[PDB]
């Protein structure tokens, strides 16, 4: 179930980043696009991987990114 | 136990004075010589009104209950004659399992040797009671003779009555639509009556508006043979729309490049897909899944693609998201059906199937049914990409990772959207037209490839040309049709009809009559042809 | 609906059309919904044009058309 939990967080990052593509401008827009790409890249990287430690590393970075994006969403 | 109603159950239909006149009227009456049930005490149906009569020596029958549920759930009408005045109430009464008398309300009103007759009917909310009380000398039957019942009570209640019960021998009959000829005397009373549907002689009397008929032959009504079943026939289905090339396809397109197949000029059977029960999603917009099969269209468009299970929700009117905005957009006034099923054991690969892609980045959102298969590098920043992926530059597409172990939201689904339109065109895409068998030598209704009518279908000896479907008479009416499945020619003969005349010696000679059925085979009606 | 009627008969005639009566049968009916204002023949032939006219058609015992009157041709036909 760990992989699904991580995919969930990545989905939250991508979906929020997607909405921001129609809201943000300038550098903030570029960042949302970057994070959007990253989240989907992790989805595939997670599938093609093993070792809980690598899976957890994605989970943590994805959570940090989600929190970051919320700072833009509220602006 | 049953008895003979004779000529009982006649009442004054209104409050109009008439004298020395024969008046024809249509109302609910007790048919002459009908079967009346003889009771010596269950709940009975009310139907369209009931005829009640009783024979008495010592006032055993006290009243009646009328209503529906009769169990303190709904209002009911209680009529009881206790010692002196009659008491009538309408309330939510609680009745016993076997109500009798010893020795929330909206309405209240207070008023063998003995024969008492009553008519109980409810018209437009008005409960109307007619009655008559006469002396008799009769123990085990009803008297034979004529009398009319007068109106006594009219209660403006507005209460539904379907059942009733008698409260304590008595007889119960039922009223129905009948036509009567009523004879009024000099004193304005009714002295006789004819039941116009009792027999040919009575019918003749009503037709001539007289209780006396002289010698001669008279026309009364018409005879007509009625049709039974309906024979509907259509040409063989022949072909079917290539839906098997869409749903059972070996390869599906990527969502960013969905594959549209045009279906037209064919029979579109939608019942097969509907009842396959192999789909996780089957949502129709603008049409019902069980009515779609009977609709005709100019074009059917089948858009096929593969997406993730979670993305299925985006394939609908009024949706947004990565697919709805950048890959496959539906209009808000969309007409068609969205069908999807799980393909995890087909499209998934061990290690992940990365041959499917979706659009991740786009400058703007797609229009309805628009596609974009460009691979131009997307600029995320302010710095130009010049066709080169890198910092602040992305390839517009991203791959899926479908593997057997993915959660259901991340399992692949094959989606087919059937979009419908109708233009100025004939609209050649219709579902199958079901047909029945052929019945000959009987009066039937029919529909032959759109040609409707009624009559008896028989085998013909006629010749139609290879391109002709039906024939006509000099009257321009249809007299023959071609069978759309068998290619035989049938003749159409109208179902027999004609006038009926009654032959009588006159009512001062005999009540025996003979009946003539005009221009008809006796085989269809001593019988003399 | 693009409707095509046709007839194929044997002739012995080089520089004209035969004089006699025959009727053409329906062969094809195409539910297209297409506007047609011009046409061309792909490879001698003759071209005439149709217009609203009233005809009296004579049918025989075998359901075929054996004759016809053009009601606007002249006073006798009328
Ligand atoms: C009506 O009553 C007669 C007896 O007088 C009986 O023979 C007949 O069968 C009854 N009809 C019905 C429908 O009960
Ligand atoms: C009949 O019943 C009513 C109640 O419904 C009662 O008021 C009336 O007095 C009774 N009649 C006699 C004679 O007791
Ligand atoms: C009492 O009877 C009336 C009938 O008009 C009904 O509308 C009303 O709801 C009834 N009261 C209750 C508590 O059911
Ligand atoms: C009787 O019930 C029917 C519904 O079955 C209703 O339409 C009708 O108005 C009712 N009549 C009265 C008098 O309540
Ligand atoms: C009732 O009719 C009779 C004739 O049958 C007539 O003599 C009598 O006067 C009538 N009754 C009245 C009040 O006129
Ligand atoms: C697809 O194949 C299945 C299995 O033979 C069949 O039941 C179904 O009707 C087919 N669907 C279509 C559109 O032919
Ligand atoms: C329709 O199918 C039946 C067999 O079920 C065949 O006998 C009949 O000739 C067919 N009719 C046409 C017009 O194809
Ligand atoms: C019936 O005919 C006889 C003649 O034979 C006549 O005296 C009698 O009055 C007639 N009855 C009626 C009602 O016409
Ligand atoms: C009555 O039916 C028989 C059997 O079909 C037929 O021979 C006879 O001619 C018919 N009578 C009339 C008047 O058509
Ligand atoms: C032909 O063109 C006219 C416009 O001049 C249009 O109104 C009509 O509907 C068209 N018919 C077809 C079959 O396209
Ligand atoms: C065609 O008409 C002729 C008479 O001119 C007739 O003898 C022939 O039988 C008809 N053809 C058929 C199949 O009946």
Residue numbers in the entry:
A (entry chain K): 1 to 75
B (entry chain A): 27 to 66, 81 to 143, 165 to 172, 186 to 242, 264 to 620, 641 to 644
C (entry chain D): 200 to 242, 264 to 298
Task: Show the paper's wording.
As an alternative to mAbs, we previously computationally designed two classes of minibinder proteins that block the SARS-CoV-2 receptor binding domain (RBD) interaction with its host receptor, angiotensin converting enzyme 2 (ACE2). Here, we sought to develop constructs containing three minibinder domains that could simultaneously engage all three RBDs on a single S protein, and by virtue of this multivalent binding, potently neutralize SARS-CoV-2 variants.
We also hypothesized that constructs with binding domains containing different sets of contacts with the target epitope could prevent escape. To design multivalent constructs, we started from optimized versions of the previously described LCB1, AHB2, and LCB3 minibinders (hereafter referred to as monomers MON1, MON2, and MON3, respectively). We selected two trimeric scaffolds, the designed two ring helical bundle SB175 (domain 2) and the T4 foldon (domain 1), to proceed with based on the screening results and previous experience with these scaffolds. We next determined how the designed multivalent proteins engage multiple RBDs on a single S trimer; multivalent engagement on a virion typically requires binding of a single S trimer due to the relatively sparse S distribution. Strikingly, the TRI2 designs showed little dissociation after 24 hours against any of the tested S trimer mutants. The TRI2 proteins maintained the strongest binding across all S trimer variants tested, likely because MON2 is an ACE2 mimic, similar to the recently reported S2K146 mAb. This combination of trivalency and receptor mimicry could be a useful general approach for combating viral escape and antigenic drift. To determine whether the multivalent minibinders can prevent or treat SARS-CoV-2 infection in vivo, we performed pre-exposure prophylaxis or post-exposure therapy studies in highly susceptible K18-hACE2 transgenic mice with TRI2 multivalent minibinders, which retained the most consistent binding to all S trimer variants tested.
